[PDB]
Amino acid sequence: SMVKMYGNWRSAAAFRVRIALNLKGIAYEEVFLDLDAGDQHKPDFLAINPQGAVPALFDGDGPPLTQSLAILDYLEETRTGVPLLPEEPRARARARSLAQVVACDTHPLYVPRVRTFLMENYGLPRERMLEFLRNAFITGLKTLETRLSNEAGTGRFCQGDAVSHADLCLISLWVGTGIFGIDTAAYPTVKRISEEVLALDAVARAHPLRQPGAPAS
Amino acid sequence: MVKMYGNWRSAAAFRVRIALNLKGIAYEEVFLDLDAGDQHKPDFLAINPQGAVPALFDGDGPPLTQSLAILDYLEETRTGVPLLPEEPRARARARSLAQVVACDTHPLYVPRVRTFLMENYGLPRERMLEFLRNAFITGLKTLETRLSNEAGTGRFCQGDAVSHADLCLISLWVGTGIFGIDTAAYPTVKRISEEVLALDAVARAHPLRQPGAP
Numbered sequence: 001s002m003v004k005m006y007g008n009w010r011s012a013a014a015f016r017v018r019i020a021l022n023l024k025g026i027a028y029e030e031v032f033l034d035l036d037a038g039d040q041h042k043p044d045f046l047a048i049n050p051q052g053a054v055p056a057l058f059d060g061d062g063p064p065l066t067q068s069l070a071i072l073d074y075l076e077e078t079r080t081g082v083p084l085l086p087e088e089p090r091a092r093a094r095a096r097s098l099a100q101v102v103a104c105d106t107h108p109l110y111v112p113r114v115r116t117f118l119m120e121n122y123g124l125p126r127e128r129m130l131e132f133l134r135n136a137f138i139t140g141l142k143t144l145e146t147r148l149s150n151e152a153g154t155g156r157f158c159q160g161d162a163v164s165h166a167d168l169c170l171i172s173l174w175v176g177t178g179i180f181g182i183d184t185a186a187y188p189t190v191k192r193i194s195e196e197v198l199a200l201d202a203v204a205r206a207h208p209l210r211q212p213g214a215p216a217s
Numbered sequence: 218m219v220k221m222y223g224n225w226r227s228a229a230a231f232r233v234r235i236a237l238n239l240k241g242i243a244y245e246e247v248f249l250d251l252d253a254g255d256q257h258k259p260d261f262l263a264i265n266p267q268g269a270v271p272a273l274f275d276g277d278g279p280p281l282t283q284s285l286a287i288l289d290y291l292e293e294t295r296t297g298v299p300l301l302p303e304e305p306r307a308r309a310r311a312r313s314l315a316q317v318v319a320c321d322t323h324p325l326y327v328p329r330v331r332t333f334l335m336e337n338y339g340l341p342r343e344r345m346l347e348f349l350r351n352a353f354i355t356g357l358k359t360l361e362t363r364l365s366n367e368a369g370t371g372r373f374c375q376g377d378a379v380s381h382a383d384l385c386l387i388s389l390w391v392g393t394g395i396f397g398i399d400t401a402a403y404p405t406v407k408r409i410s411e412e413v414l415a416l417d418a419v420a421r422a423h424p425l426r427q428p429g430a431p
């Protein structure tokens with residue numbers, strides 16, 4: 001009778017879903033887990049989510065929905081009022097391709113499990129592990145800047161003049177440049193669009209720094 | 218006609234190749250040699266700034282990249298057997314399973330990452346491969362748990378019809394052979410993978426049956 005999300009303040013995947021829920025006007029409650037303190041591995045949570053996935057979304061009766069892109073499409077197909085994809089198939093594919101530059105090629109390389117594995121498996125200090133994270137960000141940001149700057153499809157937003165899944169993924173990476181201290185001077189098109197997206201109430205309300213567990217700044 | 222810049226070993230190219238065959242879409246594949254640095258030539262960076270495969274040209278217009286986006290494009294613009302169910306919960310489940318591979322697992326073992334680990338940290342190949350192995354095992358454990366215990370699984374990942382979930386699953390499964398990952402602990406994954414492999418459209422698209430393979 002109300003959507004329930006299990007999330008985390010910092011998670012880019014949780015942020016994407018949170019934005020979509022807000023943009024579409026879907027009432028929900030979010031439960032915040034500490035992913036650094038191993039809440040995702042606790043048996044009581046595992047009782048409702050065996051593989052421990054965050055974010056996890058419960059939409060009334062049914063098993064939970066996981067994986068941020070799959071969830072975004074689920075919301076698109078079940079709540080159609082404010083569409084977050086265009087209608088034309090090539091435009092949809094481009095928007096999804098841009099989203100996946102982030103959600104497939106970039107973000108999975110900097111999740112907490114990877115950060116901890118690099119340190120624990122190789123004995124790398126945090127300072128050296130972060131070289132992997134920074135490289136992921138920079139590689140992704142370079143691709144997005146080139147594509148957004150040179151391709152005809154870009155408008156006010158990543159694809160045309162309507163917010164799409166591409167923008168939700170883009171802003172989720174952009175906020176990470178703040179959280180993880182990546183220089184963004186070289187990506188002015190990414191900046192312009194990210195600020196355009198961040199100016200929206202639905203996006204700002206969902207910002208990691210406005211969630212429980214966040215640091216001050 | 219459809220034209221794909223591909224590679225024999227690429228899991229992402231394999232996903233797309235399977236869909237083309239299943240849906241009765243003819244294609245030309247250009248096989249890049251990624252050991253030889255074909256992905257890094259200007260011509261190709263022009264096509265894909267990411268320096269990666271696959272890239273798909275569908276007539277005129279710009280190339281399409283990202284295997285999941287391409288799979289949905291093929292679903293939406295072509296006829297041929299559906300590779301997603303009709304009901305949104307089922308579609309979301311299929312996509313989620315696909316994304317365990319395509320988001321959480323596969324991006325950790327692509328060539329650019331293997332090369333970065335060796336070059337940036339000076340890791341020997343054998344030590345770099347621990348990162349690759351950990352990715353496979355992590356994804357395989359997640360898939361085994363989900364597929365074995367969730368009600369949605371049938372003959373295939375989602376119900377009894379092949380979907381995007383299976384194309385991604387088998388793209389991981391074939392890598393267990395190529396990269397030498399033990400699979401004894403994932404019997405449900407094995408069952409479904411061999412079910413999918415039995416389909417001639419999938420068997421034709423197998424990495425080891427592509428030009429450039431050993």
Ligand SMILES: [Cl-]
Nearest residue numbers: 053066067317
């Ligand atoms: Cl999952």
